[PDB]
Amino acid sequence: MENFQKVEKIGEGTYGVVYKARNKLTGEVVALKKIVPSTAIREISLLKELNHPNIVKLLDVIHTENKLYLVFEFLHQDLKKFMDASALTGIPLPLIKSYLFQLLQGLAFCHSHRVLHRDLKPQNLLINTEGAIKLADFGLARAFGVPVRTYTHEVVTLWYRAPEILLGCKYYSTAVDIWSLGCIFAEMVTRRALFPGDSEIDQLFRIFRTLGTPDEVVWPGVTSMPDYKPSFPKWARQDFSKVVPPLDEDGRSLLSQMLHYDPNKRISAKAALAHPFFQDVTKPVPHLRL
Ligand SMILES: Cc1nc(C)c(-c2ccnc(Nc3cccc(O)c3)n2)s1
């Protein structure tokens, strides 16, 4: 732990704070995360074995006196920052499609190992000059528990939270990531958050206003979920034509299958990789400003 020289503060994770750092020994640059439950130790130590082209590699795990540090391979930018940098022009579809395609490859890999991310968002998706994008903080959710805020009690967003988690489902599945990726895909395309909810119920109602209030017809058992209230307003479903303009039909159809209410109806990452939308997918390089 004294072999790392903090250089900057990358961000404020939900579990801990992240820093760009240099290994005083190897002299390598890395992303250092500070955060104890033994069950956790084993939990994360298993994640260190996750090796995929689209998963931010977890190099080492350091537990020292009521403290836990995670060493990750360093990447130069998070998807949020990049999107902001392209607000005026917007990311070209070829690049969007490529990112989406790689992201799903990773998700497919993690899901085939029963591992879930559970808190996907622009900030934990990292990109390099090579045109590759990667998932960061995978599995950690399970390693611990999801709080409300953080140390600065600042803001961790519900914007990408799947409906099942918002309605109280205790045992959600890998389908919650697809939904999150689903919402992120939309944001890239429109350059705006699909569901920018400022509270749980507001987050739920925005989804409703756009996808329509769910029922037993589209979502069997929905009315029996922990937080379902028969008193929920009933809104109609709006057509994606107005949701993701100007996205082509292939992407819109692919998107609607990522945004299905019934988790068992929501498309899997593996199946999504087979969708027509990726018929002409390529790997363009981004214009990154560092
Ligand atoms: C949140 C995050 N959690 C982890 C583990 C992150 C991580 C991992 C590897 N590399 C980076 N780099 C990075 C670089 C510029 C801006 C940024 O938000 C993140 N961040 S970001």
UniProtKB/Swiss-Prot annotation:
Q: What is its main location?
A: cytoplasm
Cofactor names from the entry are:
Mg(2+)
Q: Does the keyword Lyase apply?
A: no
Q: Report what the Swiss-Prot or TrEMBL entry states about this protein's PTMs.
A: Phosphorylated at Thr-152 by CDK7 in a CAK complex. Phosphorylation at Thr-152 promotes kinase activity, whereas phosphorylation at Tyr-15 by WEE1 reduces slightly kinase activity. Phosphorylated on Thr-14 and Tyr-15 during S and G2 phases before being dephosphorylated by CDC25A. Nitrosylated after treatment with nitric oxide (DETA-NO).
Q: Which residues are tagged with the site CDK7 binding?
A: 9, 80-81, 158
Which residues constitute the catalytic centre?
119
Q: Which GO terms describe its cellular component?
A: Cajal body; centrosome; chromosome, telomeric region; condensed chromosome; cyclin A1-CDK2 complex; cyclin A2-CDK2 complex; cyclin E1-CDK2 complex; cyclin E2-CDK2 complex
Positions where N-acetylmethionine occurs in the chain: 1
Q: Which residues make up the binding site for Mg(2+)?
A: 124, 137
Q: Which Pfam families match?
A: Pkinase
Cell location:
Cytoplasm, Cytoskeleton, Microtubule organizing center, Centrosome; Nucleus, Cajal body; Cytoplasm; Endosome
InterPro entries tied to this protein: CDK, Kinase-like_dom_sf, Prot_kinase_dom, Protein_kinase_ATP_BS, Ser/Thr_kinase_AS
Q: Name one GO molecular function term.
A: protein domain specific binding
Where are the coiled-coil regions? none
Q: How is its activity regulated?
A: Phosphorylation at Thr-14 or Tyr-15 inactivates the enzyme, while phosphorylation at Thr-152 activates it.
Explain how, and how many, cofactor molecules are bound. Binds 2 Mg(2+) ions.
Q: How does it assemble?
A: Found in a complex with CABLES1, CCNA1 and CCNE1. Interacts with CABLES1. Interacts with UHRF2. Part of a complex consisting of UHRF2, CDK2 and CCNE1. Interacts with the Speedy/Ringo proteins SPDYA and SPDYC. Interaction with SPDYA promotes kinase activation via a conformation change that alleviates obstruction of the substrate-binding cleft by the T-loop. Found in a complex with both SPDYA and CDKN1B/KIP1. Binds to RB1 and CDK7.
Name of the protein: Cyclin-dependent kinase 2
Q: Please give the organism.
A: Homo sapiens (Human)
